[PDB]
Design a protein around this ligand. Sequence first.
Ligand SMILES: *[C@@H]1O[C@H](CO)[C@@H](O[C@@H]2O[C@H](CO)[C@@H](O[C@@H]3O[C@H](CO[C@H]4O[C@H](CO)[C@@H](O)[C@H](O[C@H]5O[C@H](CO)[C@@H](O)[C@H](O)[C@@H]5O)[C@@H]4O)[C@@H](O)[C@H](O[C@H]4O[C@H](CO)[C@@H](O)[C@H](O)[C@@H]4O)[C@@H]3O)[C@H](O)[C@H]2NC(C)=O)[C@H](O)[C@H]1NC(C)=O
Ligand SMILES: Nc1ncnc2c1ncn2[C@@H]1O[C@H](COP(=O)(O)O)[C@@H](O)[C@H]1O
Ligand SMILES: *[C@@H]1O[C@H](CO)[C@@H](O)[C@H](O)[C@H]1NC(C)=O
Ligand SMILES: *[C@@H]1O[C@H](CO)[C@@H](O)[C@H](O)[C@H]1NC(C)=O
Ligand SMILES: [Ca+2]
Ligand SMILES: [Zn+2]
Ligand SMILES: [Zn+2]
Length: 706
Amino acid sequence: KSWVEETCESIDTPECPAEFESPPTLLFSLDGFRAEYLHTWGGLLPVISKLKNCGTYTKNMRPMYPTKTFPNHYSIVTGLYPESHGIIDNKMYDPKMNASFSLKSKEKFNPLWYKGQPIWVTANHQEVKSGTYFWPGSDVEIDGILPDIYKVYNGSVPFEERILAVLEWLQLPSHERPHFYTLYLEEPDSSGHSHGPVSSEVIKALQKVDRLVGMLMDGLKDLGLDKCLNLILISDHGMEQGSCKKYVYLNKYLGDVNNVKVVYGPAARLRPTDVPETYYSFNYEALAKNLSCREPNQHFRPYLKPFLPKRLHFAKSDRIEPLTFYLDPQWQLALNPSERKYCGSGFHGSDNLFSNMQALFIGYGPAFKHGAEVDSFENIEVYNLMCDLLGLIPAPNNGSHGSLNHLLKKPIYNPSHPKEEGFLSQCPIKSTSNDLGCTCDPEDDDIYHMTVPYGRPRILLKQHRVCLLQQQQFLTGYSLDLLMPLWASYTFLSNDSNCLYQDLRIPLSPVHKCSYYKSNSKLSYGFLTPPRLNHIYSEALLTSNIVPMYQSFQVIWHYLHDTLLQRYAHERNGINVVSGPVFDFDYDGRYDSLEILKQNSRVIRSQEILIPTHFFIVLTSCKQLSETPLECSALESSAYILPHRPDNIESCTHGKRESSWVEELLTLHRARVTDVELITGLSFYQDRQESVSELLRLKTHLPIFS
Ligand SMILES: *[C@@H]1O[C@H](CO)[C@@H](O[C@@H]2O[C@H](CO)[C@@H](O[C@@H]3O[C@H](CO[C@H]4O[C@H](CO)[C@@H](O)[C@H](O[C@H]5O[C@H](CO)[C@@H](O)[C@H](O)[C@@H]5O)[C@@H]4O)[C@@H](O)[C@H](O[C@H]4O[C@H](CO)[C@@H](O)[C@H](O)[C@@H]4O)[C@@H]3O)[C@H](O)[C@H]2NC(C)=O)[C@H](O)[C@H]1NC(C)=O
Ligand SMILES: Nc1ncnc2c1ncn2[C@@H]1O[C@H](COP(=O)(O)O)[C@@H](O)[C@H]1O
Ligand SMILES: *[C@@H]1O[C@H](CO)[C@@H](O)[C@H](O)[C@H]1NC(C)=O
Ligand SMILES: *[C@@H]1O[C@H](CO)[C@@H](O)[C@H](O)[C@H]1NC(C)=O
Ligand SMILES: [Ca+2]
Ligand SMILES: [Zn+2]
Ligand SMILES: [Zn+2]
């Protein structure tokens, strides 16, 4: 009986043959295996389905941006964002090197492109042999290290020969036998491109890849290793059906120009022709503004590199062009119709939150649970997972180590909460009482636990001075070094102007007085905590609850609290809200140091002001609608990092449908709670009853579009 014909068998304890001390780990990749494939064509894939039913499976695995082979395949083995490991796209360019990158090119084998530290390099430093087969970055030597057994990429090599090659390596002597293995197949990406996600060719491809995996499992069985191997069946990205009618050509707005170069695709980037002579000299801002809101329902959008949604983490790299394009699903962008390969073929590279861009993940073996289905997770989390499977100390990556513990029978690493590095001090009443120049028209522990029911946010800032200011409706973490609130937490239940009051607990600043704010200047102040809470709550009009805010953002901020927030309280039976300013001028996704904060502190209206680049807001509710946010058994989190812009060009307000463009902006700039943590230096939910690993799972979560 073949392996696919046999039923499920619990591998609680690894049954390894002699000469094996511990189960090896094989990374089997199926390029272009969209997540919807297994959802829909499960009855046609008996081998893949059994690995799913007897292993650890996830409906959707979220890949990196852009959704391309090389960036994702390299992000898997490095656990790094594409902006950090160097491989931004299949085709890219480095200005500082004056060299282009391509799959079919000599620059591909240049070690100056590959940053970070892949798993095979990590394994080598800790005396662990590795045998790879056609994995991106295996041909090139990183840090002067090459896998003990490698093969320079040759797509002409038959798949059946690739499997046998790995099977031959598994038989090597105990001292010369690799402990980590990789496998790569071009299917069903190849068939996906030429005929589309919904075709007879992909079905034939899926069945082909399915039988090929069955051959591997039969091969493992004949070697007596079917219950002694950890298998991770993964993919790089999904597949979307392209159309000729749904394509964007830049020439229609620019003309047959030759001063700009466009890397075509659903994730388009733009660089000048005179490069690197005018790589920085070229002002992209004008071109971006000249391309925005040209169509009534435009399916593309010009984005300056720091203005992209933070969830993508696609700014802090030299190779990424300062001008990018975000496109709607099923849409690609190019300069001229000649540059593009084809318009009506299957493509990928779209937003990583799109339904069809989702990838595959199946963990099978003694280390993985049997028939366990978990929630979605990013591919950068797999790096740490493999380190635990190979007994390796992971290199510094972007994955939350320990967040995938629920996949393993016996988890190896037990994570802990980050210690508070902040210098927590107290702010008593000391300075009474200045004139604010404002016109106003006519015990403690119980209120604490009510405002921060999951625990106060911890200050990961080193070594920032923070005070805890308690009110009757909210608790705010105030900064003494920046003289403004870092965060404000409050609970909003299902059903419950030019005037201000001086907070005697904080030092007075010239920007706290209303006389500072005129009706002419676009810059004003906004509240972190809505004043219409619970008559009218007056402590929300405290000076310590205001932050510098553009008038254009107030359009979004008011609708967020006056309309959406109240609706969410009815739908989710109340919400706990934590809000605050975000300062990331270096667009790296992490909080700025005191040094760079002072460099970006503008002066306006004769006063020095540090204005936020973004504003974060985290919404927390109960998974059980019968419970209020003060009595959650399990949490329901959703975070947002909203861009603080002087205007609303990104939204195309023109037509004046306020209720439409705002919600679309919120959903677009949704982010992981971890993303908010990383960019603000705060830690949430530390006093929550669930374990750290569970809380990591919660904070690293993102909803899939469509
Ligand atoms: C995802 O995960 C990845 C990996 O963890 C994260 O990527 C890492 O980000 C950090 C923070 O940005 C990076 O650290 C910085 O490294 C830079 C560059 O290093 C080089 O910089 C100069 C080259 O021109 C040079 O000055 C440096 O030379 C020495 O510098 C000091 C001297 O004592 C020494 O410590 C170094 O070892 C070098 O010998 C160096 O060649 C560096 O410029 C940054 O310095 C900042 O911080 C230091 C204090 O540590 C401070 O003194 C400086 O003033 C400055 O503020 C900083 O060290 C790191 O390189 C990244 N790692 C990888 C592998 O990419 C990424 O942040 C994560 N992303 C997200 C979204 O979380
Ligand atoms: N290691 C590699 N080196 C060069 N090309 C590769 C490698 N792996 C896959 N490819 C090619 O990349 C293409 C698929 O990439 P993608 O279109 O982004 O899904 C196919 O043409 C593959 O043959
Ligand atoms: C940049 O690269 C191009 C193409 O190889 C080359 O023609 C040019 O000389 C290079 N410029 C510099 C500054 O070296
Ligand atoms: C690629 O692999 C095929 C099949 O083994 C082989 O015939 C061919 O020689 C290889 N190409 C190169 C460039 O070596
Ligand atoms: Ca920063
Ligand atoms: Zn691919
Ligand atoms: Zn492809």
